Write a protein that binds this ligand. Structure first.
Ligand SMILES: CN[C@@H]1[C@@H](O)[C@@H](O[C@@H]2[C@@H](O)[C@H](O[C@H]3O[C@H](CN)CC[C@H]3N)[C@@H](N)C[C@H]2N)OC[C@]1(C)O
Ligand SMILES: [Mg+2]
Length: 268
């Protein structure tokens, strides 16, 4: 029988989600199983679990981000530049590969959306505006991003059947790690500025592998290696949400662990 909102809420409470919490979910809907009213059932349950003073932050990105199409170029290629849609935060759909739940999160009434087209973050709750801005090109997951503020806001990472590769917040550790050989990428995004499309070219840390040895197309990247180690070494509440094995992780703690992990392994 499909899971009801009430059942999910009680499961989230059992796992340790409390009213007022700041939660970043990573969800495998296949692992969760059938829901009474589809993915919205779990969105509603998350909102109810954090309560009217809690907050949700999700890494939603953009279905049509021209990342691969502009990667490595000092300017968007001519055909891309001419016709690509500008990122419109009110209308741009989420990137399906980070989870089908994210399109439901970002369309929730009152959801706020960050301005970085490729790293776009969605937030629901009283602190949503403070979470989502600024989010500038060149600051995807590191200092000054919504992840940085989440990590300062008692954030908890709620992994619902998702693997250790899924922990976006660990890209902050990569950004700040004092290690040699860090990979950077250059790409271009089309933004709206006073109603007009403006192409912005930037560089940032490579979110597909911070060092060469972490950059194989099919991983494991450093996020995955850090998170697997962390979960083998740390008490973390575990339990079901729907049919999915889930975990509730202190975000500041895993990020600090990840900074230390990288700096212990790689010369400065
Ligand atoms: C939406 N554009 C995205 C772009 O943001 C980026 O996405 C990466 C994504 O590939 C990474 O994750 C992906 O690759 C990992 C191995 N490198 C394993 C997990 C897999 N989801 C995330 N950890 C960080 C995102 N910014 O590279 C892929 C892409 C599709 O172009
Ligand atoms: Mg508050």
């Amino acid at each position: 029988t499909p899971w009801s909102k009430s059942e999910l809420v009680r499961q989230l409470r059992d796992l340790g989600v409390r009213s007022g919490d700041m939660v970043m979910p990573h969800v495998s809907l296949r692992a969760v199983g059938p829901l009474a009213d589809g993915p919205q059932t779990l969105v509603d349950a998350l909102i109810e679990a954090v309560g009217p003073t809690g907050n949700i932050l999700a890494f939603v990105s953009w279905r049509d981000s021209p990342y691969e199409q502009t990667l490595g170029h000092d300017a968007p290629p001519a055909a891309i530049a001419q016709s690509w849609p500008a990122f419109d935060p009110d209308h741009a759909p989420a990137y399906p590969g980070f989870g089908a739940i994210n399109e439901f999160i970002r369309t929730y009434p009152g959801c706020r959306r960050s301005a970085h087209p490729d790293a776009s973050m969605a937030a629901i709750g009283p602190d949503a505006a403070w979470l989502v801005a600024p989010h500038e090109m060149g600051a995807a997951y590191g200092p000054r991003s919504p992840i940085a503020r989440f990590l300062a806001h008692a954030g908890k990472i709620l992994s619902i059947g998702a693997g250790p590769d899924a922990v976006t917040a660990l890209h902050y550790a990569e950004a700040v790690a004092r290690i040699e050989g860090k990979r950077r990428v250059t790409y271009s995004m089309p933004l709206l500025r006073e109603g007009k499309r403006v192409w912005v070219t930037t560089s940032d840390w490579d979110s597909n592998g911070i060092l060469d040895e972490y950059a194989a197309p099919d991983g494991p990247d450093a996020v995955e290696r850090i998170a697997r180690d962390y979960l083998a070494r740390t008490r973390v509440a575990q339990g079901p949400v729907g049919g999915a094995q889930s975990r509730l992780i202190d975000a500041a703690d895993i990020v600090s662990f990840g900074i230390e992990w990288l700096e212990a392994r790689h010369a400065a």
